[PDB]
Amino acid sequence: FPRVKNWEVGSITYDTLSAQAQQDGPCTPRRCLGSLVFPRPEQLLSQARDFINQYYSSIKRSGSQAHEQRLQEVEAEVAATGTYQLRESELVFGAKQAWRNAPRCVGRIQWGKLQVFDARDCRSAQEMFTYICNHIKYATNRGNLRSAITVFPQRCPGRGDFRIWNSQLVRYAGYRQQDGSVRGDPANVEITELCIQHGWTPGNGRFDVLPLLLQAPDEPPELFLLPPELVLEVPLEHPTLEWFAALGLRWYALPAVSNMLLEIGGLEFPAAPFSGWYMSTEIGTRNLCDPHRYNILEDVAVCMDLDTRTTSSLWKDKAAVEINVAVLHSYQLAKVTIVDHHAATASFMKHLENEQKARGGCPADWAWIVPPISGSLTPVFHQEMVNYFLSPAFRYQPDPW
Amino acid sequence: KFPRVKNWEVGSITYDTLSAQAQQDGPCTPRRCLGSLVFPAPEQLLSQARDFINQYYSSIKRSGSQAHEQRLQEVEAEVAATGTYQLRESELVFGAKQAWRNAPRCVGRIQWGKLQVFDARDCRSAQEMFTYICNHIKYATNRGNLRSAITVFPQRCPGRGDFRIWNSQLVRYAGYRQQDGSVRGDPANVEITELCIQHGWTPGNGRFDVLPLLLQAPDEPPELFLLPPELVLEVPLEHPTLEWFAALGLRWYALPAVSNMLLEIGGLEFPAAPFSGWYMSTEIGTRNLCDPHRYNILEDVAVCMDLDTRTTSSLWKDKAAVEINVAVLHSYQLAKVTIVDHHAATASFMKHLENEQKARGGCPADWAWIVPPISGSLTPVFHQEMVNYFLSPAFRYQPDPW
Numbered sequence: 001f002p003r004v005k006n007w008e009v010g011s012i013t014y015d016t017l018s019a020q021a022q023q024d025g026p027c028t029p030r031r032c033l034g035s036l037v038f039p040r041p042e043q044l045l046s047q048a049r050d051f052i053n054q055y056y057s058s059i060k061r062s063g064s065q066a067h068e069q070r071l072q073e074v075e076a077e078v079a080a081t082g083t084y085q086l087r088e089s090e091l092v093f094g095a096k097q098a099w100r101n102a103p104r105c106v107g108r109i110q111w112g113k114l115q116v117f118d119a120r121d122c123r124s125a126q127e128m129f130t131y132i133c134n135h136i137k138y139a140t141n142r143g144n145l146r147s148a149i150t151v152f153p154q155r156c157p158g159r160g161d162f163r164i165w166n167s168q169l170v171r172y173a174g175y176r177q178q179d180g181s182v183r184g185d186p187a188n189v190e191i192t193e194l195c196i197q198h199g200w201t202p203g204n205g206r207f208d209v210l211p212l213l214l215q216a217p218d219e220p221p222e223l224f225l226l227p228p229e230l231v232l233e234v235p236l237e238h239p240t241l242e243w244f245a246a247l248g249l250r251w252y253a254l255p256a257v258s259n260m261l262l263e264i265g266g267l268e269f270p271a272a273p274f275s276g277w278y279m280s281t282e283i284g285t286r287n288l289c290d291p292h293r294y295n296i297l298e299d300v301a302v303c304m305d306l307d308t309r310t311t312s313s314l315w316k317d318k319a320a321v322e323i324n325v326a327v328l329h330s331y332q333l334a335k336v337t338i339v340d341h342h343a344a345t346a347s348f349m350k351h352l353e354n355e356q357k358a359r360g361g362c363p364a365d366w367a368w369i370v371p372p373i374s375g376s377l378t379p380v381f382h383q384e385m386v387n388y389f390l391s392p393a394f395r396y397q398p399d400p401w
Numbered sequence: 402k403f404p405r406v407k408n409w410e411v412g413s414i415t416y417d418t419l420s421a422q423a424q425q426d427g428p429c430t431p432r433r434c435l436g437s438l439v440f441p442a443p444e445q446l447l448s449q450a451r452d453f454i455n456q457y458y459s460s461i462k463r464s465g466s467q468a469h470e471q472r473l474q475e476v477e478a479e480v481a482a483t484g485t486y487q488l489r490e491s492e493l494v495f496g497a498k499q500a501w502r503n504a505p506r507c508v509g510r511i512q513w514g515k516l517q518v519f520d521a522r523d524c525r526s527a528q529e530m531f532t533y534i535c536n537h538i539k540y541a542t543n544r545g546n547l548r549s550a551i552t553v554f555p556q557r558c559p560g561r562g563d564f565r566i567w568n569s570q571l572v573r574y575a576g577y578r579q580q581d582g583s584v585r586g587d588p589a590n591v592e593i594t595e596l597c598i599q600h601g602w603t604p605g606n607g608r609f610d611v612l613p614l615l616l617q618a619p620d621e622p623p624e625l626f627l628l629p630p631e632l633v634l635e636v637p638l639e640h641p642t643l644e645w646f647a648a649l650g651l652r653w654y655a656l657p658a659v660s661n662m663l664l665e666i667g668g669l670e671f672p673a674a675p676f677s678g679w680y681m682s683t684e685i686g687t688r689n690l691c692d693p694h695r696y697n698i699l700e701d702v703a704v705c706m707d708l709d710t711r712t713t714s715s716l717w718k719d720k721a722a723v724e725i726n727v728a729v730l731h732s733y734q735l736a737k738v739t740i741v742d743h744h745a746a747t748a749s750f751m752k753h754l755e756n757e758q759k760a761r762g763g764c765p766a767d768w769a770w771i772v773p774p775i776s777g778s779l780t781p782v783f784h785q786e787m788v789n790y791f792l793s794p795a796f797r798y799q800p801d802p803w
């Protein structure tokens with residue numbers, strides 16, 4: 001049982017929960033690989049017992065009448081069909097629990113508040129598009145963002161798969177040149193290469209919202225134009241730097257992740273987009289200032305008349321911070337939910353405390369919980385963490401080609 | 402079959418074959434990763450020694466030669482006859498440089514070849530130990546043109562207790578507990594401060610009182626030594642544009658000299674071997690001055706800056722910390738005392754990773770320690786995946802002697 005210390009306060013806890021890790025991680029006694037982003041059939045019933053057992057534990061209902069009962073239909077379902085369907089209440093328990101278990105998510109204090117839309121009866125490409133469009137509208141909710149997940153049918157053998165080819169529902173295009181450089185977003189150049197390679201009209205500039213490539217089983221992806229009034233976006237201005245708005249910067253409201261595989265009770269949903277609300281450092285620090293993203297830090301510093309000729313002026317730092325100020329200011333003005341990294345990390349500490357009493361610990365990926373600016377100014381920096389894999393879970397999955 | 406490692410900023414990919422030589426075992430398993438935790442018989446002595454001699458004869462391009470087999474036999478004989486062995490001076494210098502090179506939490510390892518090694522293995526008392534340390538401080542400080550140095554005291558050996566420096570660094574500020582329960586000066590140093598008084602030191606009562614040295618010679622209680630004040634170079638902190646900042650009366654010292662770690666070379670242990678380089682500005686400006694459990698000045702600075710401290714979304718903490726770091730950089734540059742900013746330091750560490758990949762097939766590195774504690778993703782190390790593992794020679798943590 002690993003001893004975990006908070007160095008700001010001196011408190012000690014033990015992560016007893018780590019004793020239940022399933023799909024093992026990449027670290028060995030001889031080398032740690034925690035900084036890697038991507039770490040390297042009669043047994044469907046094993047991890048299916050597991051989940052049902054977890055479900056009935058929570059609701060004060062382990063070992064009696066109802067718990068005994070639900071254990072049988074699943075074995076009989078898999079004995080008959082080789083797979084099984086989840087009760088609606090289980091699908092919601094599994095959606096939230098998988099969120100609770102996401103080690104890289106700093107927003108887990110919200111894990112109990114989740115809206116689960118059950119698209120397990122989906123049928124075609126036009127079908128998911130309606131399911132996804134209901135999602136965006138509901139999640140966006142005019143800027144009062146509401147966490148949601150839309151769960152499409154569980155994969156079965158012999159036939160294809162529902163899969164959203166976009167990494168997110170809202171993603172900006174990226175346009176090359178004779179010189180390879182990108183107008184727009186370089187994280188979305190490949191998918192842009194496919195979206196054009198499927199009929200779409202590539203726009204002019206930097207913040208063109210990409211269309212959607214949705215994949216009904218076995219058939220080629222169908223493009224789907226997203227209705228403009230569905231895609232809520234925020235123009236970026238600064239509270240005191242009047243020229244910031246003239247830079248023409250924009251970001252979208254809904255962070256809606258559509259490429260991860262939800263796994264509950266041994267079942268696998270390759271299309272299950274979840275969405276919450278942004279933390280501001282995501283947009284301002286990573287999306288706008290990463291050197292392989294919009295990479296605007298130097299342009300903002302020029303406009304602030306900063307001395308970019310020596311690193312010791314901390315011009316990168318000063319410009320980065322005002323970018324984050326502008327992100328927060330703009331979103332709050334447009335009345336769109338956003339959380340600064342100080343507020344977010346302080347809530348995660350409260351979540352860690354809640355999980356200690358609830359489950360005896362919490363899986364947490366230190367490198368992803370500490371924000372990309374001002375890390376030691378947040379409490380999670382001084383908090384030791386244990387990272388392991390619990391089920392149910394969100395997993396990474398290969399790109400569908 | 403070795404870990405693949407990607408740099409996400411550029412798209413680079415390398416494989417860390419060096420990790421396969423990991424001579425000892427860290428804290429993680431495939432069950433759970435503990436990478437974020439701060440703190441994780443002649444036959445084995447001979448096999449460590451053999452690996453090291455092999456390493457040394459590799460460096461001098463003499464692997465497997467006559468002299469090399471000679472040394473393996475000599476070391477085998479001395480362990481048989483005495484249970485231990487003595488390094489040659491040239492092996493000691495190699496060994497110390499290599500322990501630096503292997504240190505996964507050091508961002509300054511581009512410098513690992515430029516290390517002054519002071520052989521104090523003939524040191525006989527606390528009083529001689531103190532003279533050695535004073536010469537270390539004077540050489541490394543060099544009037545603000547800092548030089549990396551290590552002074553290595555006698556190794557652990559059977560029959561005799563250890564040399565130990567009780568202080569965690571050669572230059573530390575006192576931390577006076579109080580009632581009302583708060584700490585005046587540096588709260589990281591309350592324990593060592595109390596021990597100095599209990600061993601006779603007359604305490605001060607300021608916030609920046611340099612501590613005496615508590616020096617332990619084998620099988621002897623520690624002995625207190627005052628540093629000559631003209632040997633301890635300090636930097637008073639001013640901000641280039643916020644002129645009220647000087648009125649805070651903050652100071653920091655020029656020399657960072659870690660004195661409580663254990664140097665391991667070829668199975669030998671040196672429990673007293675202080676080493677020093679020069680500061681990276683974030684250690685002072687961010688950690689030492691802004692950590693809530695250190696001097697904790699952030700809010701008082703942000704109030705003086707007229708920031709809006711009642712809501713977090715104004716990023717008042719970020720803005721005040723950036724200016725504290727600017728003051729640190731400015732003040733050391735003004736005083737002509739070596740300092741590197743986290744941008745320049747992480748850039749040179751990236752060159753170190755390239756040099757090492759070509760030299761050795763990898764580099765052990767602790768991401769959470771290499772990534773600076775402000776402006777993380779603005780530096781290139783943030784976007785570099787890294788493999789953490791333990792190589793020998795090494796600097797190791799050891800328990801406090803009390």
Ligand code: HEM
Nearest residue numbers: 099102104105106107110147149274275276277278279394
């Ligand atoms: C409600 C407010 C939420 C906030 C503020 C938030 C914040 C974050 C942040 C900042 C990250 C780091 C990702 C990055 O830096 O690119 C993250 C990762 C993640 N979050 Fe959340 N999140 C929220 C809700 C949710 C919800 C509703 C789910 C799922 C039901 C979720 C599951 C995850 C997962 C699986 C990851 C891992 C992403 C990856 O590994 O690529 N979070 N979250």
Ligand code: HEM
Nearest residue numbers: 501504506507508509512549550676677678679680681796
């Ligand atoms: C010359 C310039 C140097 C710079 C800029 C530098 C920088 C740093 C920094 C920023 C850290 C992390 C410290 C912390 O957060 O508390 C560190 C740790 C460390 N450095 Fe270096 N260093 C230098 C020289 C040296 C030398 C000469 C040695 C040994 C011969 C060394 C060995 C270490 C070790 C062992 C650690 C780990 C300390 C620990 O784990 O507690 N460094 N260094």
Ligand SMILES: Cc1cc(N)nc2cc(-c3ccc(OCc4ccccn4)c(CN)c3)ccc12
Nearest residue numbers: 037107167168255257274275276277278279282
């Ligand atoms: C639920 C939620 C709320 C919120 N506010 N932010 C969230 C951010 C992410 C998130 C994490 C990592 C990512 O990158 C993976 C990657 C892919 C390819 C190459 C490199 N890296 C991406 C890029 N799609 C998004 C996920 C969920 C979030």
Ligand SMILES: Cc1cc(N)nc2cc(-c3ccc(OCc4ccccn4)c(CN)c3)ccc12
Nearest residue numbers: 509569570657658659676677678679680681684
């Ligand atoms: C060689 C060099 C150059 C440079 N510029 N900076 C350096 C900083 C450190 C360093 C690392 C960790 C530390 O923490 C230990 C601790 C103990 C107990 C409780 C909490 N923390 C301390 C505190 N003395 C210092 C080491 C070497 C450095």
Ligand SMILES: C[C@H](O)[C@H](O)[C@H]1CNc2nc(N)[nH]c(=O)c2N1
Nearest residue numbers: 035036037367368783784785786
């Ligand atoms: C190499 C390194 O692991 C990589 O840059 C990680 C670091 N921490 C991160 N943390 C978050 N939240 N998101 C990220 O994309 C990353 N990237």
Ligand SMILES: C[C@H](O)[C@H](O)[C@H]1CNc2nc(N)[nH]c(=O)c2N1
Nearest residue numbers: 381382383384437438439769770
């Ligand atoms: C809990 C956490 O590991 C701890 O606060 C670490 C994080 N990274 C660090 N990085 C450096 N350079 N120095 C430190 O003291 C720490 N502390």
Ligand SMILES: [Cl-]
Nearest residue numbers: 255282283287
């Ligand atoms: Cl994003």
Ligand SMILES: [Cl-]
Nearest residue numbers: 657684685689
């Ligand atoms: Cl220090």
Ligand SMILES: [Gd]
Nearest residue numbers: 302303304305
């Ligand atoms: Gd101007």
Ligand SMILES: [Gd]
Nearest residue numbers: 641642643644
């Ligand atoms: Gd001024």
Ligand SMILES: [Gd]
Nearest residue numbers: 648649701705
């Ligand atoms: Gd005051």
Ligand SMILES: [Zn+2]
Nearest residue numbers: 027032429434
């Ligand atoms: Zn690990």
